[PDB]
Design a protein around this ligand. Structure first.
Ligand SMILES: [Fe+2]
Length: 186
């Protein structure tokens, strides 16, 4: 009874419908994203890697309702601990595996940050986060194989905060795209 997209194109079309209105059913979106069976032939044109850091590759702008992007994680690549600027955030595995560590929000005093959950995202799994759930870090579990993930953020946002695990202190970070629609950016 979960609508199953047969292609990434199908999934994008469904997402346009599901985010067209004022309400978004998080569990419905998550189930449909998870139901799409990752097919590298369909997303290889977005899978542009970098030697030193993960890359952000824009796929679709969702008629202004969301950003859909593919993140390419080289061997051992991981993110900072970060927030999500008051948006819905869906993360689906396309290749490999990411470990997601959920963190509590710091208070004003400097302190080591507190882990609230730790898990590995499985093949084709779609996870969900927003600022009320917590902060998180994601990282490629493998030092010999890449990981690829599909991220949907709604509403779109271009900045977030990164947090220092030792103190809780944060810095504003402007997100940049490595490519858009399969075309490398300057
Ligand atoms: Fe995130």
């Amino acid at each position: 009874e979960v609508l199953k997209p047969r292609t990434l194109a199908d999934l994008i079309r469904i997402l346009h419908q599901l985010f067209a209105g004022d309400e978004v059913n998080v569990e419905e979106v998550q189930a449909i994203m998870e139901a799409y069976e990752s097919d590298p032939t369909e997303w290889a044109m977005y899978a542009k890697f970098d030697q030193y850091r993960y890359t952000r590759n824009l796929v679709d702008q969702g008629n202004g309702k969301f950003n859909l992007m593919i993140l390419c994680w080289g061997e051992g690549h991981g993110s900072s601990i970060h927030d999500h600027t008051n948006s819905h955030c869906f993360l689906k595995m396309l290749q490999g595996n990411l470990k997601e560590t959920l963190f509590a929000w710091p208070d004003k005093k400097s302190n080591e940050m507190v882990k609230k959950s730790e898990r590995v995202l499985r093949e084709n799994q779609c996870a969900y986060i927003n600022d009320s759930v917590g902060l998180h870090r994601v990282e490629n579990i493998s030092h010999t194989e890449p990981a690829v993930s599909l991220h949907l953020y709604s509403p779109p946002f271009d900045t977030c905060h990164a947090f220092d695990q030792r103190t809780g202190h944060k810095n504003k970070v402007t997100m940049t795209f490595h490519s858009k629609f399969g075309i490398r950016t300057p």
